[PDB]
Design a protein around this nucleic acid. Structure first.
Ligand code: SF4
Ligand code: NA
Ligand SMILES: [Sm+3]
Ligand SMILES: [Sm+3]
Length: 263
DNA sequence: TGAAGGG
C-alpha cells in the first residue's frame, strides 16, 4: 500500500511539520488526514516559487551589507523529502558570527515546558541543517524540480515579471531565476550559521520569559530526522506520546478517535 | 499547496 506522503497528496513538508512531530507524531498524522480541525497575487506554483526566489535574491545582499534580515526562506531535500520553511531572523553578531534568532510569543507570561523547548530546539536545528546545505551547494535545482514538479520554461506570470523588472531584473524563464538563486546562495561568501537562539516573549508585557541557546550536534539532528522521515516515506508506523507525557492527550483534538492512548 | 502557529 501507499505512503503517508502519497496518502495525503503531499509533495513536500514544512519545517514545523517535523517540529510538531516531535510533540506527537500521531497527532501530526491526524492533522494531515483530517485537515479541517487545525503583497503580490499568484496561483500557479511556478509563480509562487518565483516569488520565493526573488525574495532570496534581495535578502542575500541585504544580509551581507546591512547585517540582518527577516523571514528568510529555506528549502532542501532531507532524507528523501523536500523540507520547506522560513527563518524568523538572521543577523551578524558584534564579533562577526551569523546568528539565527527564533521568536516565540506566548499568550500568558509563563515559562515554556521542556516538551515545548525540545520541539523548538529541533525546529531551529532544522533551519540550520537546511540553511547550511543551501549555502554549501548541497541543494540543487534538480532536487527542487524532482519533488515539486515545477516546469522550468513555462514563462513567468505577468505579476512576477512586473515586480522583477521593478527591482532591476531582466529575467525571463524560471530556470534563469533558479540558476541565479543557487549562484547567489553558494558564491556570496555566506557562512554557515554559528549560533541558534530561541527567545520566549510575552508580547503584552514585552517581558522576556527565557532564552535558549541551542547546542547544535549534526549527528543527533540527522539521526532524529532520519527517524521522523521514515514515517512519511512509509517505512514504520506512527508513534503516539510516551506514557510519561500522557497529559498532551488532555487537549488533543483527536483524543476521542485515537487508539494509541487507549492501547 | 503562503509557513508558522502554540501546547
Ligand atoms: S490522543 Fe495523545 S497519543 Fe493520540 S494523537 Fe493525541 S496527543 Fe497523540
Ligand atoms: Na516567521
Ligand atoms: Sm511578513
Ligand atoms: Sm517564530
Amino acid at each position: 500500500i501507499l505512503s503517508p506522503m502519497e496518502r495525503f497528496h503531499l509533495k513536500y513538508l514544512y519545517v514545523t511539520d517535523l517540529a510538531t512531530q516531535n510533540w506527537c507524531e500521531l497527532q501530526t498524522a491526524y492533522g494531515k488526514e483530517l485537515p479541517g480541525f487545525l503583497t503580490v497575487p499568484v496561483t500557479t506554483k511556478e509563480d509562487a516559487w518565483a516569488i520565493k526566489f526573488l525574495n532570496i535574491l534581495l535578502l542575500i545582499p541585504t544580509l551581507q551589507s546591512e547585517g540582518h534580515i527577516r523571514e528568510f526562506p529555506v528549502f532542501g531535500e532531507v532524507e528523501g523529502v523536500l523540507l520547506v520553511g522560513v527563518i524568523d531572523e538572521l543577523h551578524y553578531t558584534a564579533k562577526g558570527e551569523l546568528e539565527l534568532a527564533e521568536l516565540k510569543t506566548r499568550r500568558r507570561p509563563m515559562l515554556p515546558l521542556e516538551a515545548q523547548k525540545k520541539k523548538d530546539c529541533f525546529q531551529v536545528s532544522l533551519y540550520k541543517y537546511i540553511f547550511d546545505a543551501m549555502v554549501q551547494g548541497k541543494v540543487t535545482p534538480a532536487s527542487l524540480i524532482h519533488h515539486t514538479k515545477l516546469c522550468l520554461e513555462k514563462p513567468l506570470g505577468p505579476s512576477v515579471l512586473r515586480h522583477a523588472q521593478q527591482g532591476g531584473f531582466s529575467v525571463k524563464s524560471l530556470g534563469d531565476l533558479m540558476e541565479l538563486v543557487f549562484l547567489s546562495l553558494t558564491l556570496s561568501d555566506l557562512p554557515v550559521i554559528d549560533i541558534l537562539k530561541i527567545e520566549y516573549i510575552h508580547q503584552e508585557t514585552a517581558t522576556v520569559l527565557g532564552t535558549e541557546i541551542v547546542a547544535f550536534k549534526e549527528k543527533e539532528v540527522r539521526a532524529k530526522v532520519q527517524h521522523y522521515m521514515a514515517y512519511w516515506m512509509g517505512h514504520r508506523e506512527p508513534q503516539g506520546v510516551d506514557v510519561e507525557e500522557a497529559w498532551k492527550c488532555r487537549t488533543c483534538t483527536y483524543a476521542d478517535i485515537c487508539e494509541w492512548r487507549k492501547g
